[PDB]
């Protein structure tokens, strides 16, 4: 079981960036995928989530309207499209799977498997 995040790096303020999340060792089409960021010195902040088939998407108020979450089950990858980035978005972005039971998957599944994370820097 493994989640690896890609993308990220230096982005000018107001730019765009796409973060990938490839899962291996487990069936990717049977769990929720969550995105959490940790600012350099501050706590964790939940950002977005996506259903198994991608029908249901949830976002936090801080990034509602700017961030779009997508999923590609065939390629075993989940995406986080970042738009209109500000300097306050500089954080390490983790991806978290939800512990899903065999018969049901819910939005409140615990985030058991995380990733090493990718550092996103928004500066001029």
């Amino acid at each position: 079981e493994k989640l690896v995040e890609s993308g990220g790096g230096l982005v000018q303020p107001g730019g765009s960036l796409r973060l990938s999340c490839v899962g291996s060792g487990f069936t990717f089409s049977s769990t929720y995928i969550n995105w959490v960021r940790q600012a350099p010195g501050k706590g964790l902040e939940w950002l977005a989530s996506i259903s198994t088939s991608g029908g249901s998407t949830y976002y936090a108020d801080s990034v509602k309207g700017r961030f779009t979450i997508s999923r590609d089950n065939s390629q075993n990858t989940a995406y986080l499209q970042m738009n209109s980035l500000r300097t306050e978005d500089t954080a390490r972005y983790y991806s978290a799977r939800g512990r899903a039971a065999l018969v049901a998957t819910f939005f409140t599944d615990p985030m058991d498997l995380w990733g090493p994370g990718v550092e996103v820097v928004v500066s001029s």
Binding site: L44, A60, D61, Y94, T108, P110, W114
Partner: protein, 108 residues
């Protein structure tokens, strides 16, 4: 969601961390989950649904609802328990998952 900024415990002692809402009550319907993080490693799930321990978690980590506030109890704290502990609460009125501020535990 408010957590205590920092608290300390002695070796072999018992400490009880606290997670609470600003203007409400923490119940089992909020599904409190606790995470342990050592900077800058990824967060590690400790307790979910207030009483469930994932495989590999030491048995000394227990949770419960201690009123209007969620509680995580460590019985016999070891040297490797010195980390930052976060609490995820589920709110249904805006449909969101809210992380806590974080508490730094210092094992003395």
């Amino acid at each position: 969601v408010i957590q205590e900024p920092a608290m300390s415990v002695s070796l072999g002692g018992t400490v009880t961390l606290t997670c609470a809402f600003t203007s409400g009550s923490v119940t089992s319907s909020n599904y409190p989950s606790w995470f342990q993080q050592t900077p800058g490693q990824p967060p590690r799930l400790m307790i979910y649904k207030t009483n469930n321990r994932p495989t590999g978690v030491p048995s000394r980590f227990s949770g419960a609802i201690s009123g209007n506030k969620a509680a995580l109890t460590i019985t016999g704290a070891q040297a490797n328990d010195e980390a930052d502990y976060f609490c995820n609460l589920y709110k249904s009125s805006p449909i969101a998952l809210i992380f806590g501020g974080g508490t730094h535990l210092t094992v003395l």
